[PDB]
Amino acid sequence: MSIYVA
Amino acid sequence: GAFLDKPKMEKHNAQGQGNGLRYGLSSMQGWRVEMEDAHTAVIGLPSGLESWSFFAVYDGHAGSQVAKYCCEHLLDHITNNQDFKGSAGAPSVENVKNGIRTGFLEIDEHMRVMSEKKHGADRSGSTAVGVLISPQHTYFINCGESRGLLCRNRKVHFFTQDHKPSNPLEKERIQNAGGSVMIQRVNGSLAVSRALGDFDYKCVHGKGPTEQLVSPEPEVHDIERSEEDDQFIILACDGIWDVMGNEELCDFVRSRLEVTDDLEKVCNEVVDTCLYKGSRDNMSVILICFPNAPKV
Ligand SMILES: [Ca+2]
Ligand SMILES: [Ca+2]
Ligand SMILES: [Ca+2]
Ligand SMILES: [Ca+2]
């Protein structure tokens, strides 16, 4: 996602 | 946490008409814990631009403040600056394109001052995709990874270029600014390369505003209108495009516009389809139909 990587 | 255990499927819809156009839109939170999208839909702008319309989708991240501010003021910043006006009669194509660029940089600068004095944990940002429509031209505006698409003569006629950190021009700016693209993200964190806000990515000394790690500069593409062949425009965030292709979505909407003239419904169908395909993100879609769009 934009900041969440997983 | 990024996701809920059960998706929030409630849809917000809006629609309107004027200047020969009709629009519908749908917004849904889905599997995300927060809803950070915002949108702008206006038919008829002020001070002599009554025949003009503007539509936009804002995909916020790290909060919804920048997105919300953009949805409330981006249009004003675009039309009120000297570049957009170009002191004469009506703005030329060049005036509009320069005015849009100035609008983005100015609202960004303005937002920077306000996020400075009233300091806080609101380090949000927002991408933007939209279209400014005049009697003679459709101006596609892109800043980020949402995407706009135009269907003309039953075909995909144009669609914006997503701004990805790994695209050559982006990676170049990022590296010139002393950053790097790691695991497809700017400095390994933000998966966005162009956006308003994200001021922590805009403090590079010796670099202008369009040379920072994240850029607020939009890409503007003017398209002369075709009264006969222009059918519709779809604006949507990557929550939609991550799971549906240009040709696929275009064909889907063109097909649905033969069954119904309810644009909110068609937008709801797009959103639900993407949700059922597995999209776990917020989703916002605006559908603007021209006089010669597929008819029911
Ligand atoms: Ca978002
Ligand atoms: Ca994506
Ligand atoms: Ca998104
Ligand atoms: Ca309705």
According to the 3-state scheme, what is the secondary structure of B9-37?
EEEEEEEEEECCEEEEEEEEEEEECCCCE
Cα separation, B44 vs B24, in Å, equals 16
CB spacing of B62 vs A5 below 8 angstroms = no
Cα separation, B234 vs B63, in Å, equals 25
CB crowding B166-176: b at 16 or more within 10 Å, else e: eeeebbebbee
Cα separation, B128 vs B97, in Å, equals 15
Q: Where are the domains of chain B?
A: 1-296
Residues in chain A with CB shorter than 8 Å from the CB of B62 are 2-3
Residues B201/B190, Cβ–Cβ less than 8 Å: yes
> Does the CB of B162 have a partner CB in chain A at under 8 Å?
no
User: Annotated binding residue at B262?
Assistant: no
Taken in order B241, B246, B247, B252, the sign of the CA dihedral is: positive
Residues facing B283 on adjacent strands:
B28
How close does chain A come to B80, measured CA to CA in Å? 31
For residue B161, the one-letter residue type is Q
Residues 176 to 205 of B: which have CB under 8 A from any A CB?
Answer: 183, 185, 189-192
Residue by residue, what is the 3-state secondary structure of chain B?
CCEEEEEEEEEEEEEEEECCEEEEEEEEEEEECCCCEEEEEEECCCCCCCCCEEEEEEEEECCCHHHHHHHHHHHHHHHHCHHHHCCCCCCCHHHHHHHHHHHHHHHHHHHHHHHHHCCCCCCCEECEEEEEECCCEEEEEEECCCEEEEEECCEEEEECCCCCCCCHHHHHHHHHCCCCEECCEECCCECCCECEECHHHCCCCCCCHHHCCCECCCEEEEEECCCCCEEEEEEECHHHHCCCCHHHHHHHHHHHCCCCCCHHHHHHHHHHHHHHCCCCCCEEEEEEECCCCCCC
Nearest to A4 among B2, B59, B192 (CB): B2
CB crowding B36-73: b at 16 or more within 10 Å, else e: bbbbbbebebeeebebbbbbbbbbbbbbbbbbbbbbeb
B8 burial type by CB count under 10 A (0-12 exposed, 13-18 middle, 19+ buried): middle
Residues facing B191 on adjacent strands:
none
**Angle at the Cα of A1 from the Cα atoms of A4 and B274, rounded to 5 degrees:** 140
Q: How many residues does chain A have?
A: 6
User: Annotated binding residue at B48?
Assistant: no
Protein residues with C-beta less than 5 angstroms from the ion ligand 1: B 36, 59, 61
- Residue B24's closest CA among B285, B259, B237, B287? B287
Tracing tokens 């004003």 back to the chain, one arrives at B76
CB spacing of B62 vs A2 below 8 angstroms = yes
Cα separation, B7 vs B48, in Å, equals 44
Residues B129/B148, Cβ–Cβ less than 8 Å: yes
Residues facing B115 on adjacent strands:
none
B97 burial type by CB count under 10 A (0-12 exposed, 13-18 middle, 19+ buried): buried
Cα separation, B267 vs B55, in Å, equals 14
For residue B118, the one-letter residue type is K
CB within 8 Å of B108: residues ≥ 6 apart? B196, B197, B209, B216
Q: How many residues does chain B have?
A: 296
Residues in chain A with CB shorter than 8 Å from the CB of B281 are 1
- Residue B65's closest CA among B129, B124, B116, B145? B124
Residues B151/B250, Cβ–Cβ less than 8 Å: yes
Phi, psi of B97, rounded to the nearest 5 degrees: -65, -40
- Residue B271's closest CA among B251, B243, B232, B233? B243
CB within 8 Å of B32: residues ≥ 6 apart? B2, B3, B4, B280, B281, B282
Nearest to A3 among B59, B62, B183 (CB): B62
Residues 1 to 6 of A: which have CB under 8 A from any B CB?
Answer: 1-6
The topology under which CATH files domain B1-296 is: Phosphatase 2c; domain 1 (3.60.40)
Cα separation, B233 vs B151, in Å, equals 6
Residues B70/B104, Cβ–Cβ less than 8 Å: no
* DSSP state letter for A3: S
Cα separation, B135 vs B207, in Å, equals 38
Q: Residue B219 Cα, ligand 2 centroid: separation in angstroms?
A: 19
Which ligand lies nearest to the CA atom of residue B36 in the structure?
1
CB spacing of B183 vs A5 below 8 angstroms = yes
Lookup: tokens for B154: 């039953």
